[PDB]
Amino acid sequence: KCTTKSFNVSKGIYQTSNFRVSPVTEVVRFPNITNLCPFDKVFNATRF
Amino acid sequence: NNSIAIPTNFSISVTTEVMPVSMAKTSVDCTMYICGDSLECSNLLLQYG
Ligand SMILES: *[C@@H]1O[C@H](CO)[C@@H](O[C@@H]2O[C@H](CO)[C@@H](O)[C@H](O)[C@H]2NC(C)=O)[C@H](O)[C@H]1NC(C)=O
Numbered sequence: 001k002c003t004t005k006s007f008n009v010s011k012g013i014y015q016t017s018n019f020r021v022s023p024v025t026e027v028v029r030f031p032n033i034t035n036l037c038p039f040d041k042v043f044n045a046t047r048f
Numbered sequence: 049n050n051s052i053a054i055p056t057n058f059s060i061s062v063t064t065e066v067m068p069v070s071m072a073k074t075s076v077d078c079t080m081y082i083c084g085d086s087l088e089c090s091n092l093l094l095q096y097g
């Protein structure tokens with residue numbers, strides 16, 4: 001009914017779109033690095 | 049003006065004739081081809097419905 005957009009279907013065979021599956025959970029994978037970046041030694045230097 | 053050619057023998061031949069009748073039927077899904085299984089793209093495709 002959603003694919004034919006008409007609320008009413010006659011006799012026959014029709015191909016329908018995808019409305020079945022939907023994601024529910026998220027997967028995040030990152031490399032494990034813990035060294036904080038030298039933002040203090042680059043942005044706030046003695047003499048630019 | 050007074051000469052005619054008339055055959056005296058015959059032959060039976062078999063000739064093949066190839067003809068296409070049908071081709072491959074095809075169906076196309078709009079949402080899978082246009083939007084790569086992403087929800088943000090499918091929210092804009094509805095205006096092109
Ligand atoms: C037409 O040609 C065929 C061969 O293509 C001839 O057929 C032969 O006929 C004789 C008797 O007439 C048979 O004994 C033979 O076996 C046939 N075949 C061959 C390969 O010789 C036929 O006679 C011809 N008709 C004519 C010339 O009137």
Ligand SMILES: *[C@@H]1O[C@H](CO)[C@@H](O)[C@H](O)[C@H]1NC(C)=O
Nearest residue numbers: 001002005006007008009010
């Ligand atoms: C479907 O068709 C019937 C019969 O013509 C009609 O009465 C009905 O209103 C249609 N349904 C909707 C939801 O419009």
